[PDB]
Design an enzyme around this catalytic site. Structure first.
Site, mmCIF file in Angstrom:
data_model
loop_
_atom_site.group_PDB
_atom_site.id
_atom_site.type_symbol
_atom_site.label_atom_id
_atom_site.label_comp_id
_atom_site.label_asym_id
_atom_site.label_seq_id
_atom_site.Cartn_x
_atom_site.Cartn_y
_atom_site.Cartn_z
ATOM 1 N N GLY A 168 0.836 -1.202 0.000
ATOM 2 C CA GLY A 168 0.000 0.000 0.000
ATOM 3 C C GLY A 168 0.865 1.244 0.000
ATOM 4 N N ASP B 107 12.744 -7.680 11.549
ATOM 5 C CA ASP B 107 13.179 -6.921 10.374
ATOM 6 C C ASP B 107 13.848 -5.614 10.769
ATOM 7 O OD1 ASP B 107 13.690 -6.532 7.643
ATOM 8 O OD2 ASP B 107 11.688 -5.746 7.234
#
Ligand SMILES: CC(C)(C)c1ccc(C(=O)Nc2cn3cc(-c4cn[nH]c4)ccc3n2)cn1
Length: 355
Positions: A41, A156
């Site tokens: 997105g 991450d």
């Protein structure tokens, strides 16, 4: 205008919300800028009119099942962080709002500045001064120790996901025919992007982290948990200190060889247990020292201590902590609770310790 704009809505063929700067959501958020985009997105800067026109970063997730479901998990993680950090002192991004906008999961955060990679890049990859490395290290250990105590792993961590509260810089030098030498004024940071963050009890994605920050237990598919984040932090600190990545590679076998050359031998029990047997022969990594890549690795990948820029105590302390973070065996790797007590952090001010 807010009401009309918020109700006038369609998607494109890929499930992106069709929107532009000027549009509104929830009769509340006015889009004023673009911050970034991915397959997930978009991230837009908004003014939050229901909170005094305060600036937010708003993640608007695509109208695709896989991304919607992933975003719900991210929201769950952000909710836990918010529940557990009432004083806003643990330095993980605090979600200010979330909602479902016509199928699009939307997540609002207070607006921050440039990320630590972007800042490094804009400084021509000239590294952060040691006191900056130290302060950022302390904050990362503090933030992730908190996350870890709450049965969470980020998975991450990378410089792109660490954001300055305010990335305004000072100029040190700007000589004719050379890049401007810059230092960030305020080294306060926040940990961002909990889109991969995983609770202890949840399904663990097998291959996590971005290449350069990925630990050996992940590469070897041995299972992972909180120590994954500690390895990533060690890699990040090296990169803050030198300005280049510790592991500049894009392939597992080479990556593991680099780990061995820089850090020492992989524990035999990890090799015995990995399903990635193809990387090994008779207990040793398969590697041609004489090939083009063999030569790049032999010439570029040296024992960790060789990368020190000074020989003074604070540099030795940094490298001691980094080596503890870069332990092959995740069971032997330093925890962040332990890292916060490391003598490297004796060098902090009673001011750098305020969050
Ligand atoms: C003026 C200039 C220096 C050019 C500037 C201003 C703002 C930004 C920016 O990008 N700000 C920004 C991005 N953010 C992402 C998240 C987030 C959390 N989880 N996922 C994503 C949270 C806050 C957040 N703030 C970059 N440059």
């Amino acid at each position: 205008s807010s009401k009309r704009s918020s109700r006038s809505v369609e998607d494109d063929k890929e499930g992106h919300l069709v929107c532009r700067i000027g549009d509104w959501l929830q009769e509340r958020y006015e889009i004023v800028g673009n911050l970034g985009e991915g397959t997930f997105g978009k991230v837009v800067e908004c003014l939050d009119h229901a909170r005094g026109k305060s600036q937010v970063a708003l993640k608007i997730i695509r109208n695709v099942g896989k991304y919607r479901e992933a975003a719900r998990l991210e929201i769950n993680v952000l909710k836990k962080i918010k529940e557990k950090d009432k004083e806003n002192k643990f330095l993980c991004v605090l979600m200010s709002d979330w909602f479902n906008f016509h199928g699009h999961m939307c997540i609002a955060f207070e607006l921050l500045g440039k990320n630590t990679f972007e800042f490094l890049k804009e400084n021509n990859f000239q590294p952060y001064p040691l006191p900056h490395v130290r302060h950022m290290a302390y904050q990362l250990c503090h933030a992730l120790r908190f996350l870890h105590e709450n049965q969470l792993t980020h998975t991450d961590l990378k410089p792109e996901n660490i954001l300055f509260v305010n990335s305004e810089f000072e100029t040190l030098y700007n000589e004719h025919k050379s890049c401007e030498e810059k230092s960030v004024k305020n080294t306060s940071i926040r940990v961002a992007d909990f889109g991969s963050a995983t609770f202890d009890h949840e399904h663990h994605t097998t291959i996590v982290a971005t290449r350069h920050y990925r630990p050996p237990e992940v590469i070897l598919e041995l299972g992972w948990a909180q120590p994954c984040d500690v390895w990533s932090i060690g890699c990040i600190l090296f990169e803050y200190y030198r300005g280049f990545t510790l592991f500049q590679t894009h392939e597992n076998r080479e990556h593991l060889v680099m780990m061995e050359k820089i850090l020492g031998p992989i524990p035999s029990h990890m090799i015995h247990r990995t399903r990635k047997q193809k990387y090994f022969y008779k207990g040793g990594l398969v590697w041609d020292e004489n090939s083009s890549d063999g030569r790049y690795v032999k010439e570029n990948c040296k024992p960790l201590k060789s990368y020190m820029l000074q020989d003074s105590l604070e540099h030795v302390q940094l490298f001691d902590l980094m080596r503890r973070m870069l332990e092959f065996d995740p069971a032997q790797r330093i925890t962040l609770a332990e890292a916060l007590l490391h003598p490297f952090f004796a060098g902090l001010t009673p001011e750098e310790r305020s969050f």
